[PDB]
Structures are given as structure tokens and as C-alpha cells.
């Protein structure tokens with residue numbers, strides 16, 4: 593079955609999709625109201641100090657706000673939160689109809705997610721068509737069981753079966 | 755159920771584990787033979803140019819080799835490759851008993867994985883107890899179906915159910 597190609601586009605996207613991920617929504621306080629963006633390019637980076645990374649696309653209108661933000665929060669979604677995922681993708685409702693709750697640092701959050709990491713901006717680097725934002729975790733919130741993540745793999749949403 | 759804590763250690767590790775991932779092995783040619791390391795801190799970063807990242811721990815004896823390498827390859831494991839995962843973790847056999855196959859750039863590879871990204875070193879940044887290595891994808895190999903990844907979530911290995 594095995595095939596080899598040089599990445600210079602459908603085939604590369606399919607290949608990268610072979611790496612399973614959770615699903616997050618990264619939020620921040622924008623110039624004119626709350627902002628969020630569905631992300632799966634998140635990674636845990638460091639335990640001491642507690643650091644995480646994620647990559648906003650430089651082709652998004654929200655890139656500047658996330659890149660200039662001092663604080664942002666990463667919400668890890670449970671398998672029952674597909675609708676929350678879809679609010680913060682391309683066509684999505686964003687925060688329209690959602691209650692305004694804020695962290696002490698003023699970041700808009702989504703209660704009821706599997707995990708929320710509230711982060712202070714720590715470092716940022718350009719990486720092609722995306723940036724890499726590294727944040728220091730100031731606070732952690734967990735809710736519910738840890739073993740029912742929303743999983744995205746091979747372009748499809750699904751569950752983890754242990 | 756919802757609880758909030760400040761990350762300054764068991765609780766933080768459990769929280770970060772709530773983010774589901776695939777499982778990779780990153781390989782390179784070491785000073786005295788092939789090297790590999792099981793990694794789940796991998797992310798797709800950029801399509802144009804094709805870029806990926808992953809984070810080696812700075813507490814590993816293999817960190818210097820990966821950090822100084824010009825070339826390294828990321829192997830995305832299928833659900834049937836737990837043994838390959840375990841070869842390249844803490845106590846593992848590494849390449850002992852495995853056939854030596856090399857890329858044109860001299861990187862030792864593991865045929866038969868779901869995806870292999872052969873990368874040239876592109877950038878590197880320190881991030882606490884880990885480094886962040888960004889590589890430019892020079893070649894991609896895929897084998898078999900794309901929708902049976904080995905998944906690691908909530909500290910357990912498992913499968914994706916779409």
C-alpha cells in the first residue's frame with residue numbers, strides 16, 4: 593500500500609490528518625468583544641515552568657488579536673461538545689447566544705469543558721503560514737471525566753475507545 | 755465536578771492528559787548509531803512551506819543529538835504498533851533487533867507506519883523543560899488506511915471510533 597510523495601497538496605493534508613488530536617477552542621478578549629478559534633495544533637510543552645503551545649493560522653482575521661494578546665485560554669473539549677467546536681470554526685456563531693463569563697485576567701471562557709488552561713503570553717515565533725504561540729499556564733480548570741475527549745482524526749470527529 | 759488549581763504536579767499532568775493525541779516515533783542518526791524517541795508533543799504547523807513541530811525533553815540523554823541533527827523523521831503509528839511505541843520509550847529496546855533501513859539523507863526509518871514525515875531542521879527554540887524543534891518536510895510516506903491511529907488519551911492507549 594505504501595506510497596511516497598514530495599509535499600509541494602491534497603495528499604499532504606491527508607497525511608497530516610493521520611495524526612489524531614483532541615479539539616480545543618482558544619479564547620481572548622478582542623478589540624471589540626470576545627474572540628475564539630477552534631484549534632487542534634495545541635501541545636503540552638513544559639511542566640516546570642508549565643508551558644503549552646498552539647498555532648494560529650496567519651491567514652485568519654483573528655491572528656493579530658491572538659498574537660497581540662497578553663492572555664488567552666485553551667479549552668479542551670469533551671466528546672459531547674461538537675457544537676462548541678463548530679461555533680469557533682470558519683462559519684461559526686462564535687460567542688453569539690453564549691453567556692459572558694470572564695477570568696480574573698479578563699479572558700472570556702466557556703464553562704463545562706474537559707480542561708481549561710488560562711495562559712499568559714510567554715513567547716511567539718513565525719512558522720510559515722502559521723505562528724507558534726507559547727503560553728505559561730497560570731490556572732487550570734478540569735470538569736468531568738478525563739477520558740471522553742472529542743477526537744479529530746483522518747478528517748472525522750469521533751471518540752476514544754481505550 | 756469542576757475544580758480549579760494553580761499548576762505549581764500530579765493534577766497538572768492529569769489535566770494535560772485530557773488532550774488526546776496520536777503517537778509518534780522521531781528518529782535520527784546519532785553519533786554512534788540510530789536513535790529514536792517516542793513523542794506525542796508533535797503538531798502539524800504549516801502547509802506552505804510544509805512545516806511540523808515536536809518537543810524533545812531537555813532531561814533526556816538524546817536531546818543533544820536531536821537538537822544538533824540536520825535531519826530527523828516523524829513516524830505516526832497505527833493502532834497495531836504499540837510494540838514500536840514501547841521500543842522508543844524510557845525502558846525500551848530502541849533499534850535492537852529491528853532492520854536498518856535509511857532515507858536518502860541517512861535517517862533510520864521504520865517501514866510500515868501510518869505516516870512518515872522526513873524533515874530537515876528548520877528552527878529550534880527553548881521552552882522550559884523541553885525544546886521546540888520545527889522541521890521542513892522534505893518527503894512524505896503513507897501506508898495503509900489513515901483512520902486507525904494509535905491514540906493516547908487520559909494516560910491510556912486506545913483506538914479512534916469515528
Ligand SMILES: Cc1cc2nc3c(=O)[nH]c(=O)nc-3n(C[C@H](O)[C@H](O)[C@H](O)COP(=O)(O)O)c2cc1C
Nearest residue numbers: 629630631632633634647648649652680681682744
Ligand atoms: C478540528 C479542527 C482543528 C483546527 N485547528 C486549527 C489550528 O490549529 N489553527 C488554526 O489557525 N485554525 C484551526 N482550525 C480552523 C479555525 O477554526 C479557522 O479559523 C476555520 O475553522 C477554518 O477555515 P478558514 O481557515 O478558511 O478560516 C481548525 C478547524 C477544525 C475543524
Ligand SMILES: Cc1cc2nc3c(=O)[nH]c(=O)nc-3n(C[C@H](O)[C@H](O)[C@H](O)COP(=O)(O)O)c2cc1C
Nearest residue numbers: 791792793794795796809810811814842843844906
Ligand atoms: C505516549 C507517550 C508520548 C510521549 N511524548 C514525548 C514527547 O513529546 N517528548 C519527549 O521528550 N518525551 C516523550 N515521551 C517520553 C520519551 O519517549 C522518553 O524518552 C521516555 O519514554 C519517558 O521517560 P523518561 O522521561 O524518564 O526518559 C513520551 C512517552 C509516551 C509513552
